[PDB]
Design an enzyme around this catalytic site. Structure first.
Site, short mmCIF file in Angstrom:
data_model
loop_
_atom_site.label_atom_id
_atom_site.label_comp_id
_atom_site.label_asym_id
_atom_site.label_seq_id
_atom_site.Cartn_x
_atom_site.Cartn_y
_atom_site.Cartn_z
N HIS A 43 0.80 -1.22 0.00
CA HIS A 43 0.00 0.00 0.00
C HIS A 43 0.84 1.28 0.00
CE1 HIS A 43 0.80 -0.11 4.39
NE2 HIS A 43 0.62 1.19 4.31
N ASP A 88 -1.13 -7.55 1.64
CA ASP A 88 -0.46 -6.26 1.49
C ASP A 88 1.06 -6.39 1.47
OD1 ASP A 88 -0.50 -3.39 1.28
OD2 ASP A 88 0.14 -3.31 3.38
N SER A 182 4.74 2.34 7.77
CA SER A 182 4.34 1.25 6.88
C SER A 182 5.55 0.55 6.28
CB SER A 182 3.46 1.81 5.76
OG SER A 182 2.35 2.52 6.27
#
Ligand SMILES: *[C@@H]1O[C@H](CO[C@@H]2O[C@@H](C)[C@@H](O)[C@@H](O)[C@@H]2O)[C@@H](O[C@@H]2O[C@H](CO)[C@@H](O[C@@H]3O[C@H](CO[C@H]4O[C@H](CO)[C@@H](O)[C@H](O)[C@@H]4O)[C@@H](O)[C@H](O)[C@@H]3O)[C@H](O)[C@H]2NC(C)=O)[C@H](O)[C@H]1NC(C)=O
Ligand SMILES: *[C@@H]1O[C@H](CO[C@@H]2O[C@@H](C)[C@@H](O)[C@@H](O)[C@@H]2O)[C@@H](O[C@@H]2O[C@H](CO)[C@@H](O[C@@H]3O[C@H](CO)[C@@H](O)[C@H](O)[C@@H]3O)[C@H](O)[C@H]2NC(C)=O)[C@H](O)[C@H]1NC(C)=O
Length: 236
Positions: A43, A88, A182
């Site tokens: 992502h 992801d 992330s």
């Protein structure tokens, strides 16, 4: 990372940093798992990002810092029924290998399964204050707990029931990953068990733990791709 301190300069030799070229802006992180492979989050990664190994302070270039880019970008396309929350990962092959150095070494895929109650190290250059969106120039490190998935499920209606995510954090609040953490690794009891995915903003609220991509679901798939398997990568 909120509620922690600046990482030790030698405790994140596997931590990769992604930057745009112009302007030169930090995007997120990833994990070097092999001399020429990085595991990141789908992502936050986009094509053409610069990949830095051996970075600590973003304003400093250590003598052993290495810059790379992805020549291969593998997304998990094995089960069309999996939602976006359940896949992801992006597996990146580097344009050239990186040798070990003071600040560079790969982190192996987990060799034992994750276990509730583990203490997990989180790290990143992401937001480091729950009241202000302050981004550090150095990575911050902190400890959280691997929690029963029950502790997360009620806070994420949009996320269907799954076995492919880990629930981790601190129930009393104060310690948490946040925006632009992330892709960083969640290292529980010394094992690479999770990748920073998403949580709640504001970050580090009480009884609001975050969800982490469960790395061990991808071991066989990653190893096959590294081993050269094109087709046959997924399971039958
Ligand atoms: C570059 O550095 C990495 C070492 O990675 C570090 O490990 C030590 C030195 C610490 O400093 C850590 O901070 C770093 O993570 C080397 O790769 C590692 O090699 C070691 C060999 O000692 C492996 O660790 C052992 O693994 C044994 C089993 O090996 C097999 O299984 C693993 C998968 O779990 C696989 O990665 C490996 O290829 C074999 O298939 C195990 O029995 C033993 O108890 C111990 O855990 C480790 O697996 C390697 N890690 C990775 C990510 O490849 C390189 O050797 C080094 N380069 C050189 C030549 O210096
Ligand atoms: C991440 O690294 C940057 C880079 O700054 C470094 O500065 C030296 C210590 C050397 O290591 C250099 O190789 C390197 O560029 C840090 O930013 C810098 O912080 C220093 C120390 O606080 C600042 O010094 C200030 O200078 C001004 C004048 O501009 C005086 O008014 C100040 O009182 C003080 O002397 C420096 O300004 C700042 N430099 C830059 C270019 O930003 C940063 O501190 C570091 N991060 C962490 C968390 O350590």
């Amino acid at each position: 990372v909120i509620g922690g301190n600046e990482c030790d300069t030698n405790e994140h030799r596997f931590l990769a940093a992604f930057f745009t070229s112009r302007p030169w802006t930090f995007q997120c992180a990833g994990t070097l798992i092999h001399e020429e492979w990085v595991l990141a989050a789908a992502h936050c990664y986009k094509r053409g990002l610069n990949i830095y190994l051996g970075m600590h302070n973003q304003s400093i270039q250590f003598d052993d810092e290495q810059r790379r880019y992805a020549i291969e970008e593998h997304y998990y396309r094995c089960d069309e029924k999996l939602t976006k929350w359940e896949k992801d990962v992006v597996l990146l092959k580097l344009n050239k290998p990186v040798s070990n150095s003071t600040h560079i070494a790969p982190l192996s895929l987990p060799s034992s399964p994750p276990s509730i109650g583990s203490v997990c190290r989180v790290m990143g250059w992401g937001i480091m204050s729950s009241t202000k969106d302050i981004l550090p120039d150095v990575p911050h490190c902190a400890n959280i707990n691997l929690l029963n998935y029950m502790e997360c499920v009620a806070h994420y209606p949009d996320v269907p029931e799954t076995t492919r995510l880990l629930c981790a954090g601190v129930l009393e609040g104060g310690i948490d990953t946040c925006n632009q953490d992330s892709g960083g690794p969640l290292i529980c009891d010394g094992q690479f068990q999770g990748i920073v995915f998403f949580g709640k903003y504001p970050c580090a609220q009480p009884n609001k733990p975050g969800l982490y991509t469960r790395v061990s679901n991808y071991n066989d798939w990653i190893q096959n791709i590294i081993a050269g398997k094109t087709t046959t990568a997924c399971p039958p």
